[PDB]
Amino acid sequence: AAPKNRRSIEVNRCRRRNPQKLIKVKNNIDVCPECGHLKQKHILCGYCXXXXXXXXXXXXXXXXXXXX
Amino acid sequence: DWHLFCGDKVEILEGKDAGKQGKVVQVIRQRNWVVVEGLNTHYRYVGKTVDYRGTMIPSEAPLLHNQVKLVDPTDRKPTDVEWRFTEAGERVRVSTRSGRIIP
Amino acid sequence: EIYHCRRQIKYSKDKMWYLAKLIRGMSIDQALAQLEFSDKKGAQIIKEVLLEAQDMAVRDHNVEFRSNLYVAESTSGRGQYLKRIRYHGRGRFGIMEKVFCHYFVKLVEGXXXXXXXXXXXXXXXXXXXXXXXX
Amino acid sequence: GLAQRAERLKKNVASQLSIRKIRESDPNFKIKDFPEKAKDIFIEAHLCLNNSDHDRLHTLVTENCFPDMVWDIRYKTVRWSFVESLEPPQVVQVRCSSLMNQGNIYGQVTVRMHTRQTLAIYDRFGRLMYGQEDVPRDVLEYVVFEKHLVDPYGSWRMHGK
Ligand SMILES: [Zn+2]
Numbered sequence: 001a002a003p004k005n006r007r008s009i010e011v012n013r014c015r016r017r018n019p020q021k022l023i024k025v026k027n028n029i030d031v032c033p034e035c036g037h038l039k040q041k042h043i044l045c046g047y048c049x050x051x052x053x054x055x056x057x058x059x060x061x062x063x064x065x066x067x068x
Numbered sequence: 069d070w071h072l073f074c075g076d077k078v079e080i081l082e083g084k085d086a087g088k089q090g091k092v093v094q095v096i097r098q099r100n101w102v103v104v105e106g107l108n109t110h111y112r113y114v115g116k117t118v119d120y121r122g123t124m125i126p127s128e129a130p131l132l133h134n135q136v137k138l139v140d141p142t143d144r145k146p147t148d149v150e151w152r153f154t155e156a157g158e159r160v161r162v163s164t165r166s167g168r169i170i171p
Numbered sequence: 172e173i174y175h176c177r178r179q180i181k182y183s184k185d186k187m188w189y190l191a192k193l194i195r196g197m198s199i200d201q202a203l204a205q206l207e208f209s210d211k212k213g214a215q216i217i218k219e220v221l222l223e224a225q226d227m228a229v230r231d232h233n234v235e236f237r238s239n240l241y242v243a244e245s246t247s248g249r250g251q252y253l254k255r256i257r258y259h260g261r262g263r264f265g266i267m268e269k270v271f272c273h274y275f276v277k278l279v280e281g282x283x284x285x286x287x288x289x290x291x292x293x294x295x296x297x298x299x300x301x302x303x304x305x
Numbered sequence: 306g307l308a309q310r311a312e313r314l315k316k317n318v319a320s321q322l323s324i325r326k327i328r329e330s331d332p333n334f335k336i337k338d339f340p341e342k343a344k345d346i347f348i349e350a351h352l353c354l355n356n357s358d359h360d361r362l363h364t365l366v367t368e369n370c371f372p373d374m375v376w377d378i379r380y381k382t383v384r385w386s387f388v389e390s391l392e393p394p395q396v397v398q399v400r401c402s403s404l405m406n407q408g409n410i411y412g413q414v415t416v417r418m419h420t421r422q423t424l425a426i427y428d429r430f431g432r433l434m435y436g437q438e439d440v441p442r443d444v445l446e447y448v449v450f451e452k453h454l455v456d457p458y459g460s461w462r463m464h465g466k
Contacts, residue, residue, distance in 0.1 A: 016185075020195070022189055023190070023209070024190060025193065025205065027237050028204075028208050029204045029208070033205055038204060038207075041210055088457040088458075090456055090457060091458065105455075105456070106455045106456065106457065107457070108364075109364065110425065111363070122372060122376075123368065123369075123372070124369070124371065124372040124375070126363075126368075173432075229379075231383065232384060232429075232433075233384075233428075233433075280431065296386055
């Protein structure tokens with residue numbers, strides 16, 4: 001099918017703004033119990049964990065290379 | 069038939085620098101202008117990022133040749149140029165006042 | 172006031188406007204956290220714009236207290252469009268328009284104050300009694 | 306006090322050597338007339354800093370040492386600031402030293418003075434206040450006046466420190 005007529009500005013605004021509610025803002029922000037950095041709720045920190053996971057990955061690769 | 073050449077001492081009869089005398093550093097025939105030593109001081113930016121030190125230096129901006137006149141080696145007064153042939157069998161340009169050879 | 176602008180960056184204006192209205196009226200901290208944990212293509216960009224705006228606020232304006240800074244205004248304009256050829260079937264070519272967005276951020280010092288609260292009974296009893304007397 | 310300083314100015318090696326350079330090159334100059342004239346040029350300099358005149362500051366006052374203070378004041382212009390300063394008083398005027406260069410026909414004379422400065426700074430629309438109003442600060446300053454010789458005019462240009 002094809003549009004009968006061109007859309008007015010008002011209809012476009014009312015359609016693209018109100019019903020979609022834009023982006024609903026909740027609070028995901030929580031302070032890390034360890035380093036005190038701001039991170040997401042119900043989730044592990046992105047500071048004191050990713051570095052320890054990379055150090056654990058390097059230690060696992062070094063142990064796997066030393067065992068072989 | 070040309071007016072000003074590089075290296076001569078010249079006078080300025082027009083502008084903020086009018087009345088001052090100085091040698092010519094460079095002559096460009098493209099934009100038709102001349103540059104006088106230590107004249108028409110303007111700001112220029114040569115910076116150093118690695119050394120953190122920016123350096124602003126004064127420079128001479130090109131001036132119109134119509135506002136500049138040559139200086140006769142003898143009379144020392146500013147004058148127009150004229151083309152003549154001396155008794156030595158030479159093609160030369162001299163002052164419209166005296167007979168001193170400019171070249 | 173501290174102004175910051177970014178032009179000739181290619182992103183959807185309508186999509187960036189979603190995160191643009193998000194931080195409008197909101198304080199610097201809340202906007203930072205939001206844009207950080209907001210999921211979209213505009214999140215990173217507007218985060219960079221905000222960070223640069225804060226850096227300019229601190230360095231240039233020499234603001235004493237960073238907590239006195241909030242986002243007063245945010246807007247997204249449309250730049251030039253890059254026309255590309257989208258190949259379709261049966262020997263027909265459509266025109267794919269790649270858009271652009273110019274992001275503008277205006278910051279004003281002082282504590283942020285916004286009140287959307289409106290009493291229904293008071294406003295009704297006032298507007299009706301004033302309209303009946305006019 | 307003043308006598309010993311005068312002896313250190315006149316009778317010391319490098320200083321009297323620079324004086325020799327000056328007098329031998331240009332006998333028409335004078336040593337005693339320098340501090341007062343340099344004082345006047347200093348007053349005019351501070352007045353140029355207050356009135357924010359760039360042309361006179363560049364041409365007359367400072368040479369090649371300007372871009373620091375110039376970038377300072379111009380950044381203050383970017384932040385839209387109003388700089389009002391007054392420094393009329395003077396106590397004791399005594400020059401410091403001299404350093405010259407032959408090949409480039411350059412010269413410098415370090416001179417120190419005692420001035421009471423009042424510095425007031427306003428910022429943007431919200432009138433952000435920096436400094437203090439009508440407060441007689443006690444300031445001891447060192448300024449190096451440079452001399453350069455060209456054909457059209459002699460160049461006397463200050464250097465702040
Ligand atoms: Zn953490």
